[PDB]
């Protein structure tokens, strides 16, 4: 074998402790750059003029933040969707003021995480597996694309991308509610059904398999020792599990087929989260939640408030207060 | 505000940036407030006010025609914001205007379609690979590839 | 792919019980605190700094401004027994909006 | 910043006490007969 042939054999080797592969050739450097920049920025970055109004917001630990308040702050509204790599700045000091780290991080991250998804297909192929784990990962990935790329595109600025920080995330959520009434949007509602249901079914499946473990141990040892890695025989009794759950509800509401059950476990959260991602990605173009403001009117024409109108009052509070020095004109159009 | 007597070139906003007019990061004169992000916008109703250096203050002061005012007012009040039930405007707006921009309908629908088509691509590309190699129906119990591989540790 | 993996099916399935169940139990404890208004509302160090330094801003201080808007704008209709009348002039608002 | 002056010891013991409990248990497991 020549050098290229050998290199290819190593890259695609099924024997590396962590699989590299061709997607990994892009994933490794991009994820390392994003990680390193993030860590350094989160600790040490100076304040960033997120809203382009010369009002710098401090995100880093050394500049007065704790783990909860800290963030890498989105790039300046003055930049908008302009590409702002380090070399476009006159200095690192300028780059930092304008939120250059945010762009470097999210672009390397999105590239790296897309390659992470490809890499999941890639290894499944090398191991002779079925290929669709990567399709499940497309759900959180799509969600990351929605908040870091698609929303900024629709609104015309990376300053409206989700901040890389715990409190910045909450800021993004509250402002999103004000501007899109996301709670009243059916795609976010499907998302909630996806994650509440995902958690429910996770607990359900956990509890049912755990409930029907076949006795292989004594009381002075963990029942976990009753299963040995790679054993051929199933470790629980699915017939007893189905016997239980089918009586809890009724026979035909319970799965007796493990393949069907596990498919449902994959599908429910993944589809819901795809809708969550699509909610963000379509509210990115301002097709917003249901608006029933003043929908109910009496015989004279008096407005009779519903809970929708109370939501509206909360939303107004968010709207009027957010970015309190950034608006000069009466309508918030992006 | 200029009709009312404001000098829109020298009007300093609350932040120190021009209330109506400011510079882009490369110096072009652009509209101020949040729309600073949109300075790359180009449109027939706006372009006559554009000079070599961006928005021209002398053109702004002297050359704005009624058709430009009308168009800007029309476009401002038909912004592509609206609810799923087609109530036009911001999310806190009251019922009254039945409007969602065709631009929003067309962008959202095509994002959803493009996204699910990427999913279909992954689904079918991964399946085509597996079927071609002969393991799309599962792992052969008597020829499980991982069982012939050395342990990772 | 990830560096670690389950090797024990019994552990895997117990963990699937543990995680969402423990999460829900934790959220319940927080709500018991909220029954008493015993909130995690503030970071005191943040407030002391921001009160003395009008240039100090974090996403934490930004979210409190949003909260103050929510409270003032929703309370009169959301809490009708209080008979709140908040004149236009007292309502917290940023510029223009 | 005007932080709570007990936050440091609170955090350090919060980590150390249970971590140490686990290390003690782990090491004495390892030292048991194979």
């Amino acid at each position: 074998a020549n050098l290229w042939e050998r290199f290819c054999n190593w890259v695609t080797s099924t024997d590396n402790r962590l699989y590299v592969g061709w997607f990994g050739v892009i994933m490794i450097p991009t994820l390392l750059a994003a990680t390193i920049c993030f860590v350094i920025a989160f600790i040490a970055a100076p304040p960033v003029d997120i809203d382009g109004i010369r009002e710098p917001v401090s995100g880093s630990l050394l500049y007065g933040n704790n783990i909860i308040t800290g963030a890498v702050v989105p790039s300046s509204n003055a930049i908008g969707l302009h590409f702002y790599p380090i070399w476009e700045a006159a200095s690192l000091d300028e780059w930092l003021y304008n939120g250059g780290p945010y762009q470097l991080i999210i672009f390397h991250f999105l590239l790296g995480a897309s390659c992470y998804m490809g890499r999941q297909w890639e290894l499944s192929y090398r191991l002779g597996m079925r290929p669709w784990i990567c399709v499940a990962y497309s759900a959180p990935l799509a969600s990351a694309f929605a908040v870091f790329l698609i929303y900024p595109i629709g609104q015309g600025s990376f300053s409206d991308g989700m901040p890389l920080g715990i409190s910045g995330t909450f800021n993004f959520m509250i402002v999103f509610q004000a501007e899109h009434n996301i709670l009243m949007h059916p795609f976010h509602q499907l998302g909630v059904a996806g994650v509440f249901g995902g958690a429910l079914f996770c607990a359900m499946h956990g509890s049912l398999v755990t409930s029907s473990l076949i006795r292989e141990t004594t009381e002075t040892e963990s029942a976990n020792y009753g299963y040995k890695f790679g054993q051929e025989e199933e470790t629980y009794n699915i017939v007893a599990a189905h016997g239980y759950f089918g009586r809890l509800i009724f026979q035909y509401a319970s799965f007796n087929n493990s393949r069907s059950l596990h498919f449902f476990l994959a599908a429910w959260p993944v589809v819901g989260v795809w809708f969550a991602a699509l909610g963000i990605s379509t509210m990115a173009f301002n097709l917003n939640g249901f608006n029933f403001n003043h929908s109910v009117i009496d015989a004279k024409g008096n407005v009779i408030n519903t809970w929708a109108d109370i939501i509206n009052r909360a939303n107004l509070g968010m709207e009027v207060m957010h970015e309190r020095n950034a608006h000069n004109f009466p309508l918030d159009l992006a | 505000d200029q009709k009312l007597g404001a000098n829109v070139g020298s009007a300093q906003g609350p932040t120190g940036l021009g209330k109506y007019l400011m510079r882009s990061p490369t110096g072009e004169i652009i509209f101020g407030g949040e729309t600073m992000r949109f300075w790359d916008f180009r449109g027939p109703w706006l372009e006559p006010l554009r000079g070599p250096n961006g928005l021209d203050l002398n053109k702004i002061k002297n050359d704005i025609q009624p058709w430009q005012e009308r168009r800007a007012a029309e476009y401002m009040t038909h912004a592509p914001l609206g609810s799923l039930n087609s109530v036009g405007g911001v999310a806190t707006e009251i019922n009254s205007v039945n409007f969602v921009s065709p631009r929003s309908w067309l962008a959202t629908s095509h994002f959803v379609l493009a996204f699910f088509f990427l999913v279909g691509h992954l689904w079918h590309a991964g399946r085509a690979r597996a079927a071609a190699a002969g393991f799309e129906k599962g792992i052969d119990r008597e020829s499980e590839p991982v069982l012939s591989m050395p342990s990772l540790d | 792919i990830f560096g670690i993996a389950f090797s024990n099916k019994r552990w895997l399935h117990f963990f699937m019980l543990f995680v969402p169940v423990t999460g829900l139990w934790m959220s319940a404890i927080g709500v018991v605190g909220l029954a008493l208004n015993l909130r995690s509302y503030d970071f005191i160090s943040q407030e002391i700094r921001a009160a003395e330094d009008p240039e100090f801003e974090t996403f934490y201080t930004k979210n409190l401004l949003l909260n103050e808007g929510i409270r003032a704008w929703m309370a009169p209709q959301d809490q009708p027994h209080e008979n709140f009348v908040f004149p236009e002039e007292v309502l917290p608002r940023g510029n223009a909006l | 910043m005007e932080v709570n002056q007990l936050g440091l010891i609170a955090t350090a013991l919060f980590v150390l006490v249970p971590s140490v409990f686990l290390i003690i248990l782990y090491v004495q497991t390892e030292s048991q007969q194979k």
Binding site: L61, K228, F229 | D153 | - | M1, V3, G7, T11
Partner: peptide
């Protein structure tokens, strides 16, 4: 001191990842 604490805990977690991956008990088929 707070910053040191936060970074210290983070650094321990990263070290933990290293040991949990490269120095895990190996899975063995019985």
């Amino acid at each position: 001191m707070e910053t040191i604490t936060y970074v210290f805990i983070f650094a321990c977690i990263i070290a933990l990842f290293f040991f949990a991956i490269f120095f895990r008990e190996p899975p063995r088929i019985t």
